[PDB]
């Protein structure tokens, strides 16, 4: 036991030394020679009403028009952002939903929560009514996040400190991702969908290969649990959000932190993190009832999206980058432009 | 300006809004209360009693009494970092806490079961999400406490205890110790009841506590109290 523990410590030290040896410069020094962005002003365009409880999750559609929001009143509403009209209303069998997902093709949606079951609903049945197509069971903890890889398979996160890849047709998980010491809170899929990153309560972010089902890289540096994670549009980097009121950027190829986004006057945690279409701006939600826009390349605040009367729980940028929608616990979802 | 299909979609959206409003109106009249404790603490017994009078995850129980609807949630099986989902019950009307009165002289793999129960009660009561939420405390195993106290002194659990060994004194001391854990006494109140094989009075006590809590909340809303 002692020999293997010392070998593990030596390997950690070797990894740290190799990571340090490649830190010849920093992102801030390189980006000091480019013009900064101006004051970003966004005006709310639509105020989607109808939810009578806290908003916990939302996801933008591939068409950049339809979006689905999740609330703990037992209802999933598909909104027409262009006209505000409600498309569908799905009464959940469980009112404790904590996450929701929208299929890239739009034929199915998924959600989960304290029930430890991920339910997939078919939105294009011949009968015209939305019905549950498959229920994914096997997790021993609450579902934290879920994202559709395609119409046939889905990847989900659970509070049992493991992530699993599920086959909707078969109904049984094909791969299990173990290694996290704490509950997994968020998931993010790379543009190519070949690999994904997950954040857990252990203040560490792990890189998982979908096909091989093994951990590729591990990232650390946060002083508290990580709540949000999102891939950079290029796919070679990702950002994370933690309760320590700080956002950190990591690079897959450099395997180390690039830049840190934090302010002295921000003391509350971070709920959601998202990237702009070009990656120039980083949007993150905070428990202080507003969302702050951060300059990715300079760590300089770009703007604040105020107007929510409660905690901002989730946010997302449209696939086309036209607008960004923000959810909050006040039962109201707003679209900014 | 809207087309015929646009008008039809607007009408469908209005119908969906009406349905959502009806569902919200139905839900707003239902009492939601959370249950906490340990498996041996009597949660199963309480749930079975309530259900009779009227797999991993959280168990939801529905029962009605005196034309009042109650929704009880059990989260015992959900062993995890509770602070990540305890906030989901911020709107809970009341919290039910079950503790076995006879586990004062038992040990757990805190070492003592009773000490762990008091620690959990202190953690839940002082939680930032339940500052204004009342707690109902149930003592489930007084019948076996009668046998245990007459043979095993209570000093094993509370060394500071120096009162009489009678059952009444021990029960009063336990109740006082459990009640003193409240640091927000001004903002919230704890209702203490003793449960046994007798099942008639538990539902009535729960209904009375719920009604009193709702009355206090309404008085807060109007400005009084």
């Amino acid at each position, epitope marked *: 036991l002692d020999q293997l523990r010392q070998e593990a410590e030596q390997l950690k030290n070797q990894i740290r030394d190799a990571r340090k040896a490649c830190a010849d410069a920093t992102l801030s020094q390189i980006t000091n020679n480019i013009d900064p962005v101006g004051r970003i002003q966004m005006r709310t365009r639509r105020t989607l009403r109808g939810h009578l409880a806290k908003i916990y999750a939302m996801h933008w559609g591939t068409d950049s*028009r*339809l979006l689905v929001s999740a609330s703990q009143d037992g209802k999933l509403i598909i909104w*027409d952002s262009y*006209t505000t*009209n409600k*498309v*569908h209303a799905i009464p959940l069998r469980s009112s404790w939903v904590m996450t929701c997902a929208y299929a890239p093709s739009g034929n199915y949606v998924a959600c989960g929560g304290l029930d430890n079951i991920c339910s997939i609903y078919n939105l*294009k049945t*011949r*009968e*015209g*009514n939305v019905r549950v197509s498959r229920e994914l069971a096997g997790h021993t903890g609450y579902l934290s996040c879920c994202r559709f890889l395609d119409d046939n398979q889905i990847v989900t996160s659970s509070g049992d400190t493991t992530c699993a890849l599920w086959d909707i047709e078969t109904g049984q998980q094909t791969t299990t991702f173990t290694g996290h010491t704490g509950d997994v809170m968020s998931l993010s899929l790379a543009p190519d969908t070949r690999l994904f990153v997950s954040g857990a309560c252990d203040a560490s972010a792990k890189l998982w290969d979908v096909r091989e089902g093994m951990c590729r890289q591990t990232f650390t540096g946060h002083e508290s649990d990580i709540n949000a994670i999102c891939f950079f549009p290029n796919g070679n980097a990702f950002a994370t959000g933690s309760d320590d009121a700080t956002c950190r950027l990591f690079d897959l190829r450099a395997d180390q932190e690039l830049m840190t986004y934090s302010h002295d006057n921000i003391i509350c945690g971070i709920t959601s993190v998202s990237f702009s279409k070009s990656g120039r701006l980083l949007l993150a939600g905070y428990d202080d009832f507003n969302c702050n826009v951060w300059d990715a390349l300079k760590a300089d605040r770009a703007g604040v999206l105020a107007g929510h009367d409660n905690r901002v729980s989730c946010l997302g940028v449209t696939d086309d980058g036209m607008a960004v929608a923000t959810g909050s616990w006040d039962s109201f979802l707003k679209i900014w432009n | *300006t809207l*087309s*015929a*299909e*646009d*008008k*039809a*979609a607007v*009408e*469908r959206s209005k*119908m969906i809004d009406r349905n959502l409003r009806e569902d919200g109106e139905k839900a707003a009249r239902e009492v939601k209360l959370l249950l906490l404790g340990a498996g041996e603490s009597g949660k199963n017994t309480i749930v079975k009693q309530m259900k009779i009078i009227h797999t991993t995850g959280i168990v939801e129980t529905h029962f009605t009494f005196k034309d009042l609807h109650f929704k009880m949630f059990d989260v015992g099986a959900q062993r995890s970092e509770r602070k990540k989902w305890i906030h989901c019950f911020e709107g809970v009307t009341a919290i039910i806490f079950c503790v076995a009165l006879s586990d004062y002289d038992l040990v757990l793999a805190e070492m003592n079961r009773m000490h762990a129960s008091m620690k959990l009660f202190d953690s839940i009561c002082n939680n930032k999400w339940f500052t204004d939420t009342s707690i109902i405390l149930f003592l489930n195993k007084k019948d076996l406490f009668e046998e245990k106290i007459k043979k095993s002194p209570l000093t094993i659990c509370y060394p500071e205890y120096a009162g009489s060994n009678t059952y009444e004194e021990a029960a009063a001391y336990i109740q006082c110790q459990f009640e003193d854990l409240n640091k927000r006494k001004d903002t919230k109140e704890i209702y203490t009841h003793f449960t046994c094989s007798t099942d008639t009075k538990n539902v009535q006590f729960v209904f009375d506590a719920v009604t009193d809590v709702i009355i206090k909340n309404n008085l807060k809303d109007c400005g009084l109290f």
Partner: single-chain antibody
Amino acid sequence: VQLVESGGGLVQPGGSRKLSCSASGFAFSSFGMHWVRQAPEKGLEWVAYISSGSGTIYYADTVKGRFTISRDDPKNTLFLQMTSLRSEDTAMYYCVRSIYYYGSSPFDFWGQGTTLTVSSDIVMTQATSSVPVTPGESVSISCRSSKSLLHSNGNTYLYWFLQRPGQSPQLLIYRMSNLASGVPDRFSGSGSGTAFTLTISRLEAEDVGVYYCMQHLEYPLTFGAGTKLEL
């Protein structure tokens, strides 16, 4: 999903008749309903429509007042009260589903229909009446409208229907090139403003029938004269 119309038979002009249709296999409550008339050797014609919840009702100018249309969601039944009948009312009546939401495909399902025998609007036209053609060869059918169907929202409200011999009309394309569910990719649509064309890559025996172009921009709905393919 099945729709079975009821009622009909010989009725005198001074009499009355009540047509009833039974719906099953789908959420009838959430679906709008339409009645379509097809007199012998004549084309289709719209009668009335009921929105979900019976909140909105429309009638054709030729049937307004005479016909009272009602709905009964609990029994999944639709009724058409014809207080006064005339000679031109002798036609086969079809019941058609309709659901209106973003991405929806209304008029997707048509009932078998019942036969009743009795003892401004946008004009839709099809220049070609009969187009003889052998199997395999591509076929093109054109439809034109007196008013532009391109609404400001950015989509044209045009529908294409095919009625096989002895069968009810079947939806093919909606607004205005999207392929209806279950139809082969063989069917494609195109157009701009007022000129539209329906093309078949390679014709097969199952394509024999009559094609109707319908506009859904403004009520009352109108149907084209109809182009027949024969071999």
